[PDB]
Write a protein that binds this ligand. Structure first.
Ligand SMILES: COC(=O)N[C@H](C(=O)Nc1ccccc1CC[C@@H](CO)NCc1ccc(N)cc1)C(c1ccccc1)c1ccccc1
Ligand SMILES: [Cl-]
Ligand SMILES: [Cl-]
Ligand SMILES: [Cl-]
Ligand SMILES: [Cl-]
Lengths: 99, 99
């Protein structure tokens, strides 16, 4: 699809068999979701935002469907203001910016 | 152009007679630049995201050239870690997300 930016680019994602709403964010290097349960082991990660840095949990090789497109990659979990899909997964779904 | 997301989508901008590098950020509602002087009236604003909030100066009706495309809009100035071009100006240059 082609998504204009007059409104926030919010889409439905599916992770762990559940639907969630998430923002397609070209300004984010990584994908960070609000507190949730994910399988396996996690590693520590610090991510920097507009207000400073936060600690998150890094889970690797996680299945996630974004706007119907399947991806398998790194998902961070922590106190983000909104669920964010970052460039690590936008590249998997073949997303580009165009003007 | 078609901008890949393999790397951060950094482009050259021209504002207040200054050439700067800025990030095309679909996850940003507003445009926020690192400290600089801008003409006209301003009002304070708080913007928030990962790590919390920062205080910025809000300038309206500011002319900006983004990767050769002219746009006018509100520009926020403050302690952002990177210059961000948000949706308020991405729409003006006809920027869309495609996959
Ligand atoms: C050390 O930092 C880095 O290595 N990368 C930074 C990075 O990618 N952060 C990151 C990582 C995972 C998930 C989300 C984000 C930022 C979400 C932003 C992007 O959308 N929301 C902005 C926003 C949205 C809404 C509101 N209301 C307010 C703000 C990056 C940057 C930081 C701040 C702002 C823009 C980019 C960065 C890039 C280059 C140089 C330094 C930092
Ligand atoms: Cl942020
Ligand atoms: Cl990944
Ligand atoms: Cl505006
Ligand atoms: Cl349009």
């Amino acid at each position: 699809p082609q998504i204009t930016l007059w409104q926030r680019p919010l889409v439905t994602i599916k992770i762990g068999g559940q639907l969630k709403e998430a923002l397609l964010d070209t300004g984010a290097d990584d994908t960070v979701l609000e507190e949730m349960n994910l399988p396996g082991r996690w590693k520590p990660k610090m991510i920097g935002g507009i207000g400073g840095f936060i600690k998150v949990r890094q889970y690797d090789q996680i299945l996630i469907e974004i706007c119907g497109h399947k991806a398998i990659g790194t998902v961070l979990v922590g106190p983000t203001p909104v669920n964010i899909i970052g460039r690590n997964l936008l590249t998997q779904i073949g997303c580009t910016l165009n003007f």
